[PDB]
Symmetry: C2
Subunit: 190 residues, 2 copies
């Protein structure tokens, strides 16, 4: 029956806005003060949950990866979808989280661009994000009858194209960069 | 007896700025980083570039000119087929990026940072990609592609180049870059 009220706690609201800021502007272009101002809490309440910016960075990527893992799991466990349809829906899921949501970039892509400036803890979480995506893509493609080598190569082309397509689409509002990703999928996969 | 081949202060500032941006990104370097790198006073940097934005604009403009000259040498090379021109383009990019101390594309770096940048720098970054996309489109049109397909394929190629470079440099996985070449080789006739 009655559940607890659906109010986001302070930690969750910090994570959600940090995620948004990183996706829009990049890790080296937001501060705790930006978050405090955005959701009207004390900057000291941010330091409370995340003593350093690094702590928040690690936690944001970890949370985001968990969310994407669930989304992907739901696609690959859908028995009515062909392998090709799973890849198509993967791209739709990325669009929902990126270009469609206030012209955001992929969180992973943003950290990849900033990689050399990041603490190692964040670097390692960013690598984990891509490893999860690539493994998921490779696995789906293996169910389509592709051999191991071809599955890994195509998985890497697909994520490269997704990242580069999003990067360029969001500069111009030029959807054709994103259409190109879909065209590659549709023309390359069986 | 020619003048001696010494890079002037402005030239060395631009070169080190370009490298810092390609390694770490525009929002992760300062003039102090440049001063420490080449042992000049920060006041000397401001002399040439009063604000960081002025340096950002100059670096992209200069980098774009360098890429334009490279692309010109490729397309005036008559021994190269259209496909070979695109292969050699990606080889030129590799020289300036992955091969040079694991750097990212300067344009790609500014694209990632775009929302945080002054409009002057946004516009320079767009000019960089317009130059590349137009050049690729033109090579493809010499191979018989129509306007819409030339443009679509050029945008796929640069999208894949940018993404491949982005991911290859995270842990030295060459196969991300092999994938770019495979796409070029398998798609262009
Ligand atoms: Na960036």
């Amino acid at each position: 029956n009655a559940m607890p009220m659906n109010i986001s706690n302070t930690k969750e609201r910090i994570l959600a806005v940090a995620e948004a800021l990183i996706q829009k502007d990049g890790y080296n272009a937001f501060s705790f003060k930006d978050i405090a101002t955005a959701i009207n809490i004390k900057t000291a309440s941010i330091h409370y949950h995340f003593p350093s910016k690094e702590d928040l960075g690690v936690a944001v990527i970890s949370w985001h990866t968990d969310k994407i893992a669930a989304v992907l799991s739901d696609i690959s466990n859908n028995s009515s979808l062909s392998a090709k349809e799973k890849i198509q829906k993967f791209f739709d899921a990325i669009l929902t989280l990126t270009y469609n949501s206030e012209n955001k970039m992929c969180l992973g892509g943003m950290f990849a661009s900033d990689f050399q400036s990041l603490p190692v803890s964040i670097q390692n979480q960013a690598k984990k994000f891509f490893e999860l995506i690539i493994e998921w893509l490779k696995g789906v493609l293996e169910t389509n009858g592709y051999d191991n080598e071809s599955s890994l190569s195509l998985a890497k082309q697909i994520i490269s194209l997704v990242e580069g397509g999003l990067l360029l689409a969001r500069l111009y509002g030029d959807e054709t960069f994103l259409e190109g990703v879909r065209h590659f999928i549709d023309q390359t996969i069986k």
